[PDB]
Amino acid sequence: GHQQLYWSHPRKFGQGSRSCRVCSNRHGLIRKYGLNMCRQCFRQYAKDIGFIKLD
């Protein structure tokens, strides 16, 4: 479509304007502390960031 109608809707709020910064998915996202990763992607990189499971 043309530019007036191709993105006619505002993607400024809600889960559609929020995607995981690794897997681009819109379910199971964590945005606390500005992670913006998926709940399945964060468990892969938790140690690499440096989260340690203490209790």
């Binding site: 993105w7 993607r11 910064r21 690794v22 681009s24």
Partner: protein, 95 residues
């Protein structure tokens, strides 16, 4: 797509050999192409056409395309912009 955008892609590729992306059809203007008004979508398709032709090397990493210059692809932009061979990119400047 206009030829002005297609030419506007091919400059920054020659100097350093690196062009990036974000994979967003929806987002309208690419940060590195300042005051040239080239959508990132055209960057994606112009370097995807070069990917099947073997002029760039792709390496997808966390929603970011990374593009490269092949050895044979050096001479391809030297025919498009007609850049004479005594002008070297940033590949062989230092050391």
């Amino acid at each position: 797509m206009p030829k002005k955008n297609r030419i506007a892609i091919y400059e920054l590729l020659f100097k350093e050999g690196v062009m990036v992306a974000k994979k967003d059809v929806h987002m309208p203007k690419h940060p590195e192409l300042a005051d040239k008004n080239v959508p990132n979508l055209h960057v994606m398709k112009a370097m995807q056409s070069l990917k099947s032709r073997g002029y760039v090397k792709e390496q997808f990493a966390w929603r970011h395309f990374y593009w490269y210059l092949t050895n044979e692809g050096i001479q391809y932009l030297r025919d498009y912009l007609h850049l004479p061979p005594e002008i070297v990119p940033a590949t062989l400047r230092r050391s």
